[PDB]
Every structure is written in structure tokens, then in C-alpha cells.
Design a binder for this molecule. Structure first.
Ligand SMILES: NC(=O)c1ccc[n+]([C@@H]2O[C@H](COP(=O)([O-])OP(=O)(O)OC[C@H]3O[C@@H](n4cnc5c(N)ncnc54)[C@H](OP(=O)(O)O)[C@@H]3O)[C@@H](O)[C@H]2O)c1
Ligand SMILES: NC(=O)c1ccc[n+]([C@@H]2O[C@H](COP(=O)([O-])OP(=O)(O)OC[C@H]3O[C@@H](n4cnc5c(N)ncnc54)[C@H](OP(=O)(O)O)[C@@H]3O)[C@@H](O)[C@H]2O)c1
Ligand SMILES: CCc1nc([C@H]2CCCO2)c(C(=O)N[C@@H]2[C@@H]3C[C@@H]4C[C@H]2C[C@@](O)(C4)C3)s1
Ligand SMILES: CCc1nc([C@H]2CCCO2)c(C(=O)N[C@@H]2[C@@H]3C[C@@H]4C[C@H]2C[C@@](O)(C4)C3)s1
Lengths: 258, 258
């Protein structure tokens, strides 16, 4: 029941939108006629994305350059982006810190930096965005991974940050449901996707089929527009059948009902 | 299968061992004739734990006081504990930052502090302990929560840190399966426990049956001794059945190739 018209004139933020899945989401939103504000560290790459977004038919497109390692940048970013659009309908949280497939050695540094960038910056962005999202009865879209639901070797710091996202965002979704805050939260569980980053990282190490980044970007936007609690997107139909955790839903509902 | 004799003469670190579950674990290990090193911030409270451990029959008992907000203290603590005992067989990670039941609003200070103390310091402690645990084919015991596997309101920052523990420690367990490091990792999934902190925190907010802290503590040591991947301890039989995620283990084992 998704309709591309669900996004026309909507005010959307997309993080990590200079390349990969983030860039594909900005292009999709542009084609749907949304107002977009994209962010990443590369000002030059973001300018090119914003230009193609206006070409594609966006109601408006702007960018704000900076690092999500900086919590002051994150807080101010949401305010600046909201002031540029005159509100906020959907917050798409998609950036991560650069990571590789390697065994955990003595890297507290990569663990701390992955936690600050992949998890804490998302919380700061939410807190900053929530007054406008409350006014619009908007949506928060949190891009995660299969490695955020299940254990795989070579991605320990990454997995920790992605598991932290589920814990945080699913707990506040329960709070919003009980306090009657009509701000939806969509957690996106993605399998391996064919971005230049993933294809380089995975070469000669992993032998899995990667899914198309364009289709993946559209499935995230659909999830958010339909206010779905979770989106599952993987190349395998077998993997997609096993990802759902019905016991967790019963365990949550047992507490919820009583 | 378990025998208390499995802990006799074992060299064990217990963090957050001045009260609650941590103190009860130190007491059980002491009765079992283990060597124990306890930590927490209160030197006066730890002294009383050390005294009673000797009275109970510990092979040796020592305390080191400090805050796990200090990563330098965490590193130095393991090294000092190791010297005190002449090695290390088991590392029990149990401390958390002080937490109360509250709806999340704008407390990034509590989010960051929960991630630093409940998750980051566990990693730091693990890195510092790994050479000794590798040499003794030791064990890492990670105290988590049902809120570290499932979503509940009033504990967002807390849940994120416990979910982060699962992601990190379960990913490293898969890595030890490839490098064949003989260090076991036990994640303990606990329901509400009758500790003084929890009874005061739930008062007038939540109505749930708490399980006993003495049996909780023993159940944790037993899972550590038997090198189990997960320990489940909850007052309900239904919830104990539902905490297992068999789709996750299929998804993980189906990946365990290449
Ligand atoms: N591709 C996959 O296989 C896969 C699988 C599962 C989940 N996912 C998830 O999908 C999302 C995007 O993945 P992707 O492959 O499309 O990534 P990507 O192509 O490498 O893009 C990452 C984006 O984040 C930005 N970024 C990097 N460091 C940053 C920082 N410190 N501050 C702010 N922004 C930063 C990058 O731009 P700058 O370098 O200019 O800052 C870029 O715009 C991530 O959350 C990822 O975990 C991907
Ligand atoms: N009780 C429950 O219902 C329950 C349920 C599920 C899971 N758990 C888990 O079980 C574990 C123990 O819980 P508990 O209820 O027994 O806790 P507790 O009685 O409140 O004890 C917490 C311990 O951590 C220490 N601590 C606090 N802050 C610290 C810091 N900054 N640095 C170092 N140490 C610190 C405390 O002593 P000082 O204040 O002197 O430092 C104390 O020794 C935790 O991991 C908790 O998440 C408990
Ligand atoms: C199929 C299940 C998944 N495994 C991985 C993991 C486990 C094995 C391979 O990837 C996933 C994942 O999220 N990979 C990301 C890609 C590849 C790597 C690691 C992570 C972040 C990246 O930037 C680099 C994009 S999803
Ligand atoms: C059985 C499901 C659980 N709910 C909670 C949650 C949801 C409602 C009650 O606690 C659990 C939990 O881990 N509680 C802890 C107690 C009570 C509070 C919060 C947390 C940390 C404490 O120090 C204070 C001990 S386990």
C-alpha cells in the first residue's frame, strides 16, 4: 500500500547521504518530490548529490557538511536542517564510521569510535529532532544490519554499535507507545548490500550475494512511510524467513498486556 | 554435571562485588575455595566482602577500589589482580553505572555514561585479561539482562548497553571459534533479581516477581564453570522458554563456513 505521493512535500533528513544507500535514498526522495537535507563529511560530494536531487524533482534540496564524531555538529545540524525546511517529517539515520573485516585485536579505539559515531550520534540527532517530529507526528528511520541482530566474526565493534541501536530505539518505541507520542520508529535490518564500500571490504574474504543498493534504499523509505517497526532486506529469501523473532514479540507483549 | 569443586583454587575477578549479585558471587566462590579479587568504588564495603570471603574459606581474597568510568583504572586493576593471584582463570564482569526507571527525554549524559561503564569498561577489562585467560584456557562471564535481549520502556540507555554486550561478546565468541582461542564467553540473561538496588528502583513503578540473588549468583558461576554460551535466570518458566532465539543460532550456524 506504499504510494510515492506519501513523500511529496515531506521534510526529510538523510545522514551518510554522499554515497551508497544514503545517496540512493536522497535520489528516491527527490523523485517523489520531498524536501531533502543531506549530510556527510565531503562538502564537494554532497553538492553533486544536491544538484542531482534538484534535477530529479525534489521540492528543495540542501546539504550540511561535517563529522558525526562531533556531538555539537549533530545537535546544531538538526536545528539548521529543520530551519531550512520549516519543519521535519522524517529523520533517516544512516551514517557509520569507516570499518573493515578484521579480527578484534587490542582495538578499544575502533570500539569507542564505532560506538560514538554509529550509536551515540544517532541518539543526539533524535533528541534534537524530536520537538519537530512531535509537531508533524513524523518518523525516525534507523538503518541497521543483520549483524545488529545476529553474531558474525570480523565485525565485533560494528555489531556492538548496531545491537546498541536496537536496544535504544526499541525501548523508546515502547515508551512512545505508552506515552502516546505518535513518532514512529523503523529499525532496518539489512543483509550485505552492493555499495562500493561493502564490495571493497568483502573482496576475497566473504562469498555472499549482495543485494542492489537502489532497491534497498526504496525498501527503507517504504518502511518509514508505512511506519513499519522493522524492515528486513536481504538477497536470500531463506535468510529473510529466519530473521523474525516471534518469541521476543510474545516476551514484550507479556509485559505490555500486564 | 556442575560440581562446586570445579572452582577450587581457581583465580577469579568479580567486578561490582561490594553488594547485590556481585557480592553473592564472591561469597559462593569463597565457599568453593577459590582465589578472589573483588572491585567496586567503596573501599569500606569491599573490605567487609574480603573479610567474609576469608571467613567462608577462600584460598585468598583481595580488594582493589576504583571507578570503572576510569579506563586507566580498569587496565591497571586487571594487571594488579593478576599479580595478587599469580594468574587468572575467570573474569566476572558485573558492574553497571547507577540506573533508575525513567522515561527517556534528553539525558545524553546518562546514555554516554551507561555506554562507558556498562559496555566500554567491559571491553577494556577483557583486553587487559586476555593474555592471562589465553594461558590458563579461562572464562569471561558477562552479566546482562532480559532488557539486553528484549525491549521494555524506562530503561533505554541501560538496554542499549546490554544489547551492545551481546553484539560485541557474541561476535568475539565466533572469532575465537576461528582462531581457536580457548577462552569461553558466558552471557547471563537475567530477569528481575531481589537486590536492594532493584527493589528500591521498581518501588511504585513496576510490579514484577524478583528471583533470589543467592541462586542467581550460583547459576552465573555454574554457567561460567560449564563454559555455557548463555545462562538464563528468571522467576517465570514461560519467559525462560521464550528467551532462546533458535532462528539466530540457525542463521549463525548456516553462516559458519569459509
Ligand atoms: N553495504 C552493506 O553491505 C550494508 C549492510 C548492512 C547494513 N548497512 C548499513 O547501511 C548504512 C550505509 O551503508 P553504506 O554501505 O551505503 O555506506 P557508505 O557507502 O560507505 O557511506 C557511508 C556514509 O557515511 C558517511 N560518513 C562516514 N564517516 C562519517 C562521519 N564520521 N560522520 C558523518 N558521516 C560519515 C560517508 O561520507 P563521508 O566519508 O564523506 O563522511 C557516507 O556518506 C550503514 O548504517 C550500514 O551499517 C550496509
Ligand atoms: N537486580 C536486578 O534486577 C538485575 C536484573 C538483570 C540484570 N542485572 C544485572 O546484574 C548486575 C549486578 O546488579 P545488582 O542489582 O546486583 O547491582 P548493585 O547491587 O546495585 O551493585 C552494583 C555494583 O556495581 C558497583 N558500581 C557502581 N558504580 C560503579 C562504577 N562507576 N565503577 C565501578 N563499580 C561501580 C557498586 O558499588 P559502588 O557503588 O561502591 O561502586 C556495586 O558493587 C548488573 O550488571 C545488572 O545490570 C540485575
Ligand atoms: C549477511 C549478514 C551480514 N554480514 C555482514 C558483515 C559480516 C561479514 C561481512 O559483513 C553485514 C554487514 O553489515 N556488513 C557491512 C558491510 C561490509 C563491511 C562490514 C559492515 C560495514 C561495511 O562498511 C564493511 C559494509 S550484514
Ligand atoms: C524481567 C525483565 C526485566 N526488566 C527489567 C527492567 C524493566 C522494568 C524493571 O527493570 C530488568 C532489569 O535489568 N532491571 C534492572 C533492575 C531495576 C532497574 C533497571 C535495571 C537496573 C537496576 O539497577 C534498576 C536493577 S530485567
Amino acid at each position: 500500500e506504499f504510494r510515492p505521493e506519501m513523500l511529496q512535500g515531506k521534510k526529510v533528513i538523510v545522514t551518510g547521504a554522499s554515497k551508497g544507500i544514503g545517496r540512493e535514498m536522497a535520489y528516491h526522495l527527490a523523485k517523489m518530490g520531498a524536501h531533502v537535507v543531506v549530510t556527510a563529511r565531503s562538502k564537494e560530494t554532497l553538492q553533486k548529490v544536491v544538484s542531482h536531487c534538484l534535477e530529479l524533482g525534489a521540492a528543495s534540496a540542501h546539504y550540511i557538511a561535517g563529522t558525526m564524531e562531533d556531538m555539537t555538529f549533530a545537535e546544531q545540524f538538526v536545528a539548521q536542517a529543520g530551519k531550512l525546511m520549516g519543519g521535519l517529517d522524517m529523520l533517516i539515520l544512516n551514517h557509520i564510521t569507516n570499518t573493515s573485516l578484521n579480527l578484534f585485536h587490542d582495538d578499544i579505539h575502533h570500539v569507542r569510535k564505532s560506538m560514538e559515531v554509529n550509536f551515540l550520534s544517532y541518539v543526539v540527532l533524535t533528541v534534537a529532532a524530536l520537538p519537530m517530529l512531535k509537531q508533524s507526528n513524523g518518523s525516525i528511520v534507523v538503518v541497521s544490519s543483520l549483524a545488529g541482530k545476529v553474531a558474525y566474526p570480523l565485525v565485533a565493534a560494528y555489531s556492538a554499535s548496531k545491537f546498541a541501536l536496537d536496544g535504544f530505539f526499541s525501548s523508546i518505541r515502547k515508551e512512545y507507545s505508552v506515552s502516546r507520542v505518535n513518532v514512529s520508529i523503523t529499525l532496518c535490518v539489512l543483509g550485505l548490500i552492493d555499495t562500493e564500500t561493502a564490495m571493497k571490504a568483502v573482496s576475497g574474504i566473504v562469498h555472499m550475494q549482495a543485494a542492489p543498493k537502489e532497491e534497498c534504499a526504496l525498501e527503507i523509505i517504504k518502511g518509514g512511510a508505512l511506519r513499519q517497526e522493522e524492515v528486513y532486506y536481504d538477497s536470500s529469501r531463506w535468510t529473510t524467513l529466519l530473521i523474525r523473532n516471534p518469541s521476543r514479540k510474545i516476551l514484550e507483549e507479556l509485559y505490555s498486556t500486564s
